[PDB]
Amino acid sequence: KFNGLTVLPPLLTDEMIAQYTSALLAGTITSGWTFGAGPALQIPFPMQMAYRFNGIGVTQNVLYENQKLIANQFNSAIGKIQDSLSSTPSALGKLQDVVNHNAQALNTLVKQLSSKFGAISSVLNDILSRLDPPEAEVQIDRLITGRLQSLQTYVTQQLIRAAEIRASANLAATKMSECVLGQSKRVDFCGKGYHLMS
Amino acid sequence: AYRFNGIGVTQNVLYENQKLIANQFNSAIGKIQDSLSSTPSALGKLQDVVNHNAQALNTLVKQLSSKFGAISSVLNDILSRLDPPEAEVQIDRLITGRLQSLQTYVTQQLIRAAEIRASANLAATKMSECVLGQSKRVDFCGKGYHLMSFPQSAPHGVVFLHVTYVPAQEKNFTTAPAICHDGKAHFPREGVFVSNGTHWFVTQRNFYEPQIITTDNTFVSGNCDVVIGIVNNTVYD
Amino acid sequence: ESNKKFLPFQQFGRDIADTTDAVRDPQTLEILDITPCSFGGVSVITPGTNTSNQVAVLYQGVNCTEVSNVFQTRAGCLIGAEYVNNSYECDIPIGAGICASYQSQSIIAYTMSLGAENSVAYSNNSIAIPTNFTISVTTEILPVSMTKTSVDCTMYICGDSTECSNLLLQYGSFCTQLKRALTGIAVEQDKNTQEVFAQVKQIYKTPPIKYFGGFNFSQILPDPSKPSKRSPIEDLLFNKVT
Amino acid sequence: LLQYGSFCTQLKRALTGIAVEQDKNTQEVFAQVKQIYKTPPIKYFGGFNF
Numbered sequence: 001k002f003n004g005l006t007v008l009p010p011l012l013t014d015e016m017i018a019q020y021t022s023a024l025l026a027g028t029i030t031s032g033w034t035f036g037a038g039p040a041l042q043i044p045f046p047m048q049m050a051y052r053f054n055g056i057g058v059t060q061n062v063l064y065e066n067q068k069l070i071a072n073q074f075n076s077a078i079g080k081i082q083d084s085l086s087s088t089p090s091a092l093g094k095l096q097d098v099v100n101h102n103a104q105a106l107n108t109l110v111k112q113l114s115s116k117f118g119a120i121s122s123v124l125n126d127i128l129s130r131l132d133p134p135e136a137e138v139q140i141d142r143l144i145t146g147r148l149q150s151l152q153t154y155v156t157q158q159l160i161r162a163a164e165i166r167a168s169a170n171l172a173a174t175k176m177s178e179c180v181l182g183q184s185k186r187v188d189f190c191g192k193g194y195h196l197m198s
Numbered sequence: 199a200y201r202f203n204g205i206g207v208t209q210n211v212l213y214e215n216q217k218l219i220a221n222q223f224n225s226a227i228g229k230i231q232d233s234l235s236s237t238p239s240a241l242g243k244l245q246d247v248v249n250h251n252a253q254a255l256n257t258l259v260k261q262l263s264s265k266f267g268a269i270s271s272v273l274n275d276i277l278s279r280l281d282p283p284e285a286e287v288q289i290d291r292l293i294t295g296r297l298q299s300l301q302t303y304v305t306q307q308l309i310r311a312a313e314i315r316a317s318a319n320l321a322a323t324k325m326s327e328c329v330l331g332q333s334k335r336v337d338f339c340g341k342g343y344h345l346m347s348f349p350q351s352a353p354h355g356v357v358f359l360h361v362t363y364v365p366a367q368e369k370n371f372t373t374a375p376a377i378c379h380d381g382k383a384h385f386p387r388e389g390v391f392v393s394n395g396t397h398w399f400v401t402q403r404n405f406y407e408p409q410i411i412t413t414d415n416t417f418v419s420g421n422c423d424v425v426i427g428i429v430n431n432t433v434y435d
Numbered sequence: 436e437s438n439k440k441f442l443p444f445q446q447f448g449r450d451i452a453d454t455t456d457a458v459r460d461p462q463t464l465e466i467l468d469i470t471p472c473s474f475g476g477v478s479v480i481t482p483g484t485n486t487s488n489q490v491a492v493l494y495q496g497v498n499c500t501e502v503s504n505v506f507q508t509r510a511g512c513l514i515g516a517e518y519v520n521n522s523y524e525c526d527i528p529i530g531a532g533i534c535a536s537y538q539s540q541s542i543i544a545y546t547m548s549l550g551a552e553n554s555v556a557y558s559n560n561s562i563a564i565p566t567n568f569t570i571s572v573t574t575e576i577l578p579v580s581m582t583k584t585s586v587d588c589t590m591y592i593c594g595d596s597t598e599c600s601n602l603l604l605q606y607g608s609f610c611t612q613l614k615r616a617l618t619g620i621a622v623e624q625d626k627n628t629q630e631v632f633a634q635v636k637q638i639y640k641t642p643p644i645k646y647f648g649g650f651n652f653s654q655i656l657p658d659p660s661k662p663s664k665r666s667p668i669e670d671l672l673f674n675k676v677t
Numbered sequence: 678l679l680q681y682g683s684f685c686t687q688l689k690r691a692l693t694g695i696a697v698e699q700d701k702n703t704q705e706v707f708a709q710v711k712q713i714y715k716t717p718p719i720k721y722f723g724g725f726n727f
């Protein structure tokens with residue numbers, strides 16, 4: 001490999017994304033939904049939880065008289081998540097398929113260089129040092145016509161994959177805007193049940 | 199007033215501040231023009247399409263004058279100079295090259311059409327939701343609490359003017375989840391309890407407008423032992 | 436020099452990509468590993484032409500030893516840019532969190548800044564309530580359509596010659612699919628426009644007297660004076676785009 | 678290969694556009710707010726554990 005192909009690094013490192021996520025988490029913890037539509041306004045967490053409970057049709061005294069039970073249930077549900085992720089083998093399959101496909105395409109492109117496409121040999125130097133120019137022109141033309149199609153196919157496949165990746169990114173951005181920065185009433189958009197937080 | 203009531207603000211807020219709101223809206227509408235006038239990059243998306251199309255067409259034409267591994271790129275010279283039984287190879291090479299170019303152009307246009315259609319579908323949904331109604335989805339029709347929208351046309355595109363509401367000039371206050379009185383708990387129907395240091399009032403959540411506490415604004419619903427952080431104060435009957 | 440345990444009956448050596456990377460000595464008994472000579476890509480970082488005339492050179496994927504002093508970044512080797520300590524918004528992206536800008540005046544490379552730090556106070560019994568509002572207006576621009584084109588295979592591939600047309604028949608029907616696809620795209624453009632704009636079943640007319648409780652809509656309503664009957668904002672948008 | 682037409686610049690352009698869009702996607706998704714909030718030094722959110 002690495003005989004004409006290069007991989008560029010992303011503009012944003014792996015720490016800036018973590019900083020962005022931490023900022024979002026702090027904003028949604030200490031301010032509720034108010035930090036996504038203007039200046040951030042402080043509010044105690046149980047009070048915003050009461051607001052969220054009222055947002056789904058349940059009065060505040062239900063939460064205020066059941067604070068410890070809800071806190072314990074939330075703690076247990078959060079704790080089980082790590083075990084759920086670790087136990088299931090093919091949990092992060094979608095994020096692995098991208099890497100697998102991107103490696104497979106490059107491997108196929110590299111391996112395509114060892115095909116004759118119809119010629120005496122598949123190495124330019126041997127053809128140049130073995131035959132006269134009048135036949136070397138034909139051999140070189142054959143090899144060029146062989147390789148151009150492979151390059152075009154690779155480019156087309158990359159474009160087609162990029163379209164789907166962009167669609168998924170748009171969906172993720174919409175989900176971040178709607179489920180995280182505020183509550184949602186769309187059914188099954190953010191989880192299964194009546195949405196509270198994200 | 200109806201639109202103001204749709205985000206959590208009472209009508210008397212608008213009815214007592216009509217001139218200020220009208221002046222703010224007029225100032226924003228007047229100022230919006232200079233934003234489009236300067237920074238010409240803003241209409242980038244509406245321009246690239248045009249540019250792209252032109253570029254593509256140009257390339258196709260410039261692909262006509264190419265040898266494609268032949269003697270010449272003109273059919274007449276190939277026909278005249280070489281005898282017809284041999285000129286077939288050159289004609290075939292030229293035909294293959296031009297067919298490949300046409301196929302590439304067609305495939306590129308086919309790929310671009312899908313993205314254009316997706317953008318058009320998003321624009322249609324935005325016109326359906328933001329213009330002909332009021333939207334609760336966050337950051338969909340603007341930035342803030344959505345109030346209304348106005349459409350305008352443009353070459354190969356649409357422009358949306360979103361009019362939204364943004365809070366400002368906040369202030370700190372002390373709050374309690376409930377109020378204890380005569381051994382009974384009281385919770386606010388809609389709003390929040392606020393103390394200015396000595397007294398206690400109940401207000402909304404988006405505009406400071408304190409009111410005296412009365413059994414009309416609250417419901418009892420329980421006792422004064424389960425709740426944590428409950429403070430006790432008198433309630434006017 | 437070779438480091439692998441060459442079996443004493445083989446001559447060549449290949450890899451996963453099937454490339455020669457080991458040659459047996461023709462005069463002695465030794466194997467030599469062959470590695471390609473260093474190569475990379477070159478990028479030029481410049482501000483606007485009518486602002487200065489200096490440039491910076493980025494060699495991608497190489498160390499600075501293989502080549503306003505030099506600098507080594509995760510993306511490669513930078514030459515002509517001076518590193519600094521501060522952090523601003525990105526001006527010309529380069530690589531992994533490294534940007535360049537123009538600022539005597541020279542070209543400085545730095546680490547981009549995410550934003551201004553903030554820390555909202557949090558307590559068990561405190562709240563913040565606003566006391567005033569602001570009405571804001573923003574813009575959103577969306578493309579809707581595309582240019583509709585059509586092509587002719589016979590006139591493009593061949594000119595007025597008939598031999599080319601006769602030879603073209605040997606390729607079958609490789610020139611009827613193209614017309615079908617182009618026609619489909621052309622129809623889809625009109626479908627997109629009709630779906631986006633044709634939402635009302637009737638044509639409404641504004642009253643001649645325009646007093647909407649003090650609000651002023653003169654900058655968005657159509658202007659009778661202009662022959663095209665377009666709003667000033669619409670006229671500006673139509674003039675801006677070429 | 679020089680006399681085969683401009684079949685290579687239009688191959689570089691597509692890859693460049695793909696890379697630019699890929700770099701833009703992360704900025705669109707994550708970079709929503711432009712202020713870096715921080716949690717309080719003492720963590721007690723009404724009994725909830727984060």
Ligand SMILES: *[C@@H]1O[C@H](CO)[C@@H](O[C@@H]2O[C@H](CO)[C@@H](O)[C@H](O)[C@H]2NC(C)=O)[C@H](O)[C@H]1NC(C)=O
Nearest residue numbers: 217218219220221222225366367566567568569
């Ligand atoms: C709420 O904000 C408005 C707008 O900033 C304030 O109205 C301004 O008041 C100042 C003080 O005299 C005037 O100079 C400005 O001309 C007013 N603005 C407009 C658009 O007329 C208003 O006073 C603020 N109210 C509170 C309670 O803070």
Ligand SMILES: *[C@@H]1O[C@H](CO)[C@@H](O[C@@H]2O[C@H](CO)[C@@H](O)[C@H](O)[C@H]2NC(C)=O)[C@H](O)[C@H]1NC(C)=O
Nearest residue numbers: 224227228645646647649650651652653654667
């Ligand atoms: C509604 O806004 C328009 C736009 O500003 C006002 O038209 C202005 O009228 C004044 C009065 O002579 C002129 O000096 C300005 O040049 C006009 N503006 C433009 C852009 O031409 C109009 O007066 C406003 N409506 C009312 C009732 O005041």
Ligand SMILES: *[C@@H]1O[C@H](CO)[C@@H](O[C@@H]2O[C@H](CO)[C@@H](O)[C@H](O)[C@H]2NC(C)=O)[C@H](O)[C@H]1NC(C)=O
Nearest residue numbers: 075076078079082720721722723724725726727
């Ligand atoms: C929040 O949950 C974490 C995870 O259980 C708690 O950390 C545990 O604390 C206990 C007591 O010190 C230790 O025995 C465990 O080993 C800790 N777990 C881990 C994974 O380190 C943490 O204490 C909880 N928060 C509060 C306020 O109790």
Ligand SMILES: *[C@@H]1O[C@H](CO)[C@@H](O)[C@H](O)[C@H]1NC(C)=O
Nearest residue numbers: 367368369370371555556563
């Ligand atoms: C509220 O209090 C915090 C710290 O106690 C302070 O930083 C903030 O400015 C206060 N808010 C107002 C509106 O004064």
Ligand SMILES: *[C@@H]1O[C@H](CO)[C@@H](O)[C@H](O)[C@H]1NC(C)=O
Nearest residue numbers: 393394395396397398399408
């Ligand atoms: C708090 O509100 C009471 C209610 O009448 C008022 O008498 C008092 O002056 C107020 N104090 C402050 C500091 O605003």
Ligand SMILES: *[C@@H]1O[C@H](CO)[C@@H](O)[C@H](O)[C@H]1NC(C)=O
Nearest residue numbers: 378380381422428429430431
């Ligand atoms: C009122 O609340 C205080 C705590 O702030 C408490 O000490 C007191 O006993 C309460 N009043 C009554 C009558 O219980």
Ligand SMILES: *[C@@H]1O[C@H](CO)[C@@H](O)[C@H](O)[C@H]1NC(C)=O
Nearest residue numbers: 473497498499500501502507
């Ligand atoms: C410097 O270049 C050499 C190439 O000879 C390379 O092996 C080395 O890793 C480079 N230095 C760093 C820090 O990458």
Ligand SMILES: *[C@@H]1O[C@H](CO)[C@@H](O)[C@H](O)[C@H]1NC(C)=O
Nearest residue numbers: 518519520521522544545546
């Ligand atoms: C900051 O400046 C010091 C010199 O005071 C230097 O050693 C250090 O490398 C600089 N750091 C950055 C990130 O520029």
Ligand SMILES: *[C@@H]1O[C@H](CO)[C@@H](O)[C@H](O)[C@H]1NC(C)=O
Nearest residue numbers: 557558559560719720721723
């Ligand atoms: C708020 O009250 C809780 C309840 O115990 C306490 O843990 C916390 O320390 C209090 N906040 C401050 C700033 O003291």
